[PDB]
Chain A
Amino acid sequence: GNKIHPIGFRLGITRDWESRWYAGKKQYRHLLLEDQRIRGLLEKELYSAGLARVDIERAADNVAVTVHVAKPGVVIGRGGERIRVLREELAKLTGKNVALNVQEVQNPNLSAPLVAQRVAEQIERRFAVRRAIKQAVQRVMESGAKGAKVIVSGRIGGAEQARTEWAAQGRVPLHTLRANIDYGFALARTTYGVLGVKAYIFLGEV
């Protein structure tokens, strides 16, 4: 029972909020609810595109919604009809009638959430967990990545007793503020239960 969330730890320096906007006390809770519904609809749709993040900005009755994805070809669709339907759902949920953008993620293996999602997928397909982890860490490390760590939680291999498998290399200095460590988390829903998957990636310092 320790180790605060590294993103939340770093939000001031070498990390920035996913939702950046100002609002009053009579406003905030509502816009927040909205953002939450947006992310909740987006993540249960665009999953197959591998979204690593969703940014949300506002000024007046307008919302950025910059979606970071590994495979923009999925969110575009054929000739751009997918993004049309998505903007349609967006306007149907929130009547604000706002915009949408798509940013490609170069080297999806350098973004933690995607790595975690990968390992999670492999676990859901009944891969060998230990090797899945070691492999993932290897792939992350081989491209940039001054450090990497991946953590899988209990019931590894469907075992009756929960366990924790480790597999990290490079440097992952969680206590350093200027670290700039991407963190990501993915579940695994299996027949025997649920597995947590954490992913730490350390790239650059100052």
Chain B
Amino acid sequence: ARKALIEKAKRTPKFKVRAYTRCVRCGRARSVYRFFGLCRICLRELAHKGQLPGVRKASW
């Protein structure tokens, strides 16, 4: 996550298509779950801390 690239958030991307999501926490580009706004790593870390309500370990 390069700091200049956090220019990602833009009210004026100049095009809707140039708009891409990032991780709100670590700034990761790839693997960003839309539901949590996080990336997958952060997702697992916070899920493990219990800071994501309702999120539990799944087994079946």
Interface residues of A (CB under 8 A from B): 4-5, 7-9, 11-12, 15-23, 25, 28-30, 32-33, 35-36, 39
B35 touches A35 (CB 8 A): no
Question: Quick one: which of A7, A12, A22, A23 contacts B56, CB cutoff 8 A?
Answer: A12
Report the minimal beta-carbon distance from A100 to chain B, rounded to whole angstroms. 18
The CA of A7 and the CA of B50, in the complex, are separated in Å by 7
Q: CA–CA, A35 to B46, complex, Å?
A: 12
State how many angstroms separate the Cβ of B59 from the closest Cβ of chain A.
Answer: 10
Q: Is the interface of B mostly helix, strand, loop or mixed?
A: loop
CB neighbours (8 Å) of B48 from chain A are: 4-5, 7-8
Q: How many residues of chain B are within 8 Å of chain A by beta carbon?
A: 18
CB neighbours (8 Å) of A11 from chain B are 50, 55-57
Q: How far is the CA of A5 from the CA of B48 in the complex (A)?
A: 6
B12 to A: closest C-beta gap in Å: 21
Listed in ascending order, the chain B residues whose CB lies under 8 Å from chain A are 24-25, 34-38, 47-57
Closest Cβ–Cβ distance, residue B54 to chain A (whole Å)? 8
Of all chain B residues, the one with the shortest Cβ separation from A17 is B50
Taking a contact as CB atoms under 8 Å apart, the answer to whether A33 and B37 are in contact is yes
Residues on the A chain within 8 Å of B57, using CB: 8-9, 11-12
Cross-chain contact of B35 among A9, A19, A28 (Cβ < 8 A): A28
